[PDB]
Design a protein around this ligand. Structure first.
Ligand SMILES: C[C@@H]1COCCN1c1cc2n(n1)[C@@H]1CCC[C@@H]1NC2=O
Ligand code: NA
Ligand code: NA
Ligand code: NA
Ligand code: NA
Length: 529
């Protein structure tokens, strides 16, 4: 029906990022050829964006075409749950597509889907005390204990958000109703589901006791040594505090791991202003699981970034690219406390203080006579890959405040980033560079003169092209976060998705994007020396 020139225009429009606004002329064109476009699943979101949903006759025809359209890919349906859509049939269609996702994929989107409840019908959620989003999420949680664990903690954090309670009371009451609905469904279910309900309650009381313990340690006004002694003494009094030995419960941070308590003798406070605790949990497997427990601290921005880093890692692995990344787990248990999975590591700043160079560090703990610069080839391969992964990922996410205390290294060669208080282009100092590499980091692989430097560049190109291909998904997930209580998002909600979108350079072809990434890396490295 449309000629070659029109098809080229339509294909450009269909390729747009999910939050790019269509012009009036593009809306006219998509509508004109709506019947031709029903055979392209990628065109459906563009068509739905061109409908005037406030005109009953047009909404009706649009819903007729929706039923005849080649169904969109499951992950594309996240766009239909954003704030743009109030039409109930559109939003139920999105849930119907999401019902086809497996539990592993749904978990990767769950943080954002909980935010998307803000765009649902609050009366329907309350009156539940065909599937809408609330009903769907609860239904899937009732069948999967991992989903139930994260749904519980994600929602309870929303219930405790005093900002929401003060500034958006109806939204706060909705989340209360979601929790009530969730508890309703769990109690109504069979034995395995009612057991799940009791285990969530047990986790909550454990966290409550841990919070009370942290406060007791901080009413102390002794030095750090005295506070470590207080922390260990309180943890050791199980009759008083009940944290050294408890009946088995899922670890909120990673519920597949059941824990029996916390080891009292090895608990210490970090030497930092907020004095978070390092705690070793006794696992059911008879092992130990170290965490950081932060108290008096909002972990939600870190929680989001580590969730997105975990997604990006899984997407790269899906494309058979394992860049040896460290997406450590982060879970907020309230707006003021939460857990982080502790990875044995050393900050690069400490490596330079004690060994002088990343290379000296690798030569000490991973020597190899015939290896690159006397270092194990496997360790160097792991180093190059992880540098590349984090270079591309922190560039896309605009991570700031990149000093050598936030760059961590393992003896197996993994480099990874921590502490994501500055994202989306924010930085303590002005005019941060678009790509934040460290001189010590290039030096760690042998300098620009090493063959490792070209291996690093090559892995950046590959990772960048792979993540570009999932830009629709990544951008849709940020679009669902724009109203969230996340500091660097709430600063400029209407600009948030574009800040990520621009990093993908979707205006460039693959070959042009590789050229651009090459120039960006080289320019950043050149500026360092
Ligand atoms: C848990 C991860 C991964 O394992 C190594 C340690 N990592 C982190 C993360 C943070 N830190 N260390 C520092 C130390 C105390 C708080 C500060 N802030 C962070 O965000
Ligand atoms: Na009402
Ligand atoms: Na410590
Ligand atoms: Na504390
Ligand atoms: Na890991």
């Amino acid at each position: 029906k449309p000629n070659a020139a029109t098809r080229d225009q339509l294909n450009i429009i269909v390729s747009y990022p999910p939050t790019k606004q269509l012009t009036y002329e593009e809306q006219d064109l998509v509508w004109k050829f709506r019947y031709y476009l029903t055979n392209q699943e990628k065109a459906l979101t563009k068509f739905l964006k061109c409908v005037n949903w406030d005109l009953p006759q047009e909404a009706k025809q649009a819903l007729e075409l929706l039923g005849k359209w080649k169904p969109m890919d499951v992950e594309d349906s996240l766009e239909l749950l954003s704030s743009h859509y109030t039409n109930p049939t559109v939003r139920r269609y999105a849930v119907a597509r999401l019902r086809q996702a497996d539990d592993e994929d749904l978990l990767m989107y769950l943080l954002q889907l909980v935010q998307a409840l803000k765009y649902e019908n609050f009366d329907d959620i309350k009156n539940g005390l065909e599937q809408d989003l609330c009903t769907f999420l609860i239904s899937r949680a009732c069948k999967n204990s991992t989903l139930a664990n994260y749904l519980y903690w994600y929602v309870i954090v929303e219930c405790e958000d005093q900002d929401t309670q003060q500034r958006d009371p109806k939204t706060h009451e909705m989340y209360l109703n979601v929790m009530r609905r969730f508890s309703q469904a769990l109690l109504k279910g069979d034995k395995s589901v009612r057991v799940m309900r009791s285990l969530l309650a047990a986790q909550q009381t454990f966290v409550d006791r841990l919070v009370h313990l942290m406060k007791a340690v901080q009413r102390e006004s002794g030095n750090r040594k005295k506070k470590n002694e207080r922390l260990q003494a309180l943890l050791g009094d199980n009759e008083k505090m009940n944290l050294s030995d408890v009946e088995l419960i899922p670890l909120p941070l990673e519920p597949q791991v059941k824990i029996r308590g916390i080891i009292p003798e090895t608990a210490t406070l970090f030497k930092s202003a907020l004095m978070p605790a390092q705690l070793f949990f006794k696992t059911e497997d008879g092992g130990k699981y170290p965490v950081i427990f932060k108290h008096g601290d909002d972990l939600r921005q870190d929680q989001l970034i580590l969730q997105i880093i975990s997604l990006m890692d899984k997407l790269l692995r899906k494309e058979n690219l394992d860049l040896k990344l460290t997406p450590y787990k982060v879970l907020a248990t309230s707006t003021k406390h939460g857990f982080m999975q502790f990875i044995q590591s050393v900050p690069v700043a400490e490596v330079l203080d004690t060994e002088g160079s990343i290379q000296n560090f690798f030569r000490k703990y991973a020597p190899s006579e015939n290896g690159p610069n006397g270092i194990s080839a496997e360790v160097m391969d792991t180093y190059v890959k992880s540098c590349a992964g984090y270079c591309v990922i922190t560039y896309i996410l605009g991570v700031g405040d990149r000093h050598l205390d936030n760059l961590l290294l393992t003896k197996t060669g993994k480099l990874f980033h921590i502490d994501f208080g500055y994202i989306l282009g924010r930085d303590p100092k002005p005019l941060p560079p678009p790509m934040k590499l460290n001189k010590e980091m290039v030096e760690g692989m042998g300098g620009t003169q090493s063959e490792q430097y070209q291996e690093f560049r090559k892995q950046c190109y590959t990772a960048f092209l792979h993540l570009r291909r999932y830009s629709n998904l990544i951008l849709n997930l940020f679009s669902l976060m724009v109203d969230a209580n996340i500091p660097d998002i709430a600063l400029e909600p209407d600009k948030t998705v574009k800040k990520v979108q621009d990093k993908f350079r979707l205006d460039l072809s693959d070959e042009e994007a590789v050229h651009y990434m090459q120039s960006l890396i080289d320019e950043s490295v050149h500026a360092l020396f």
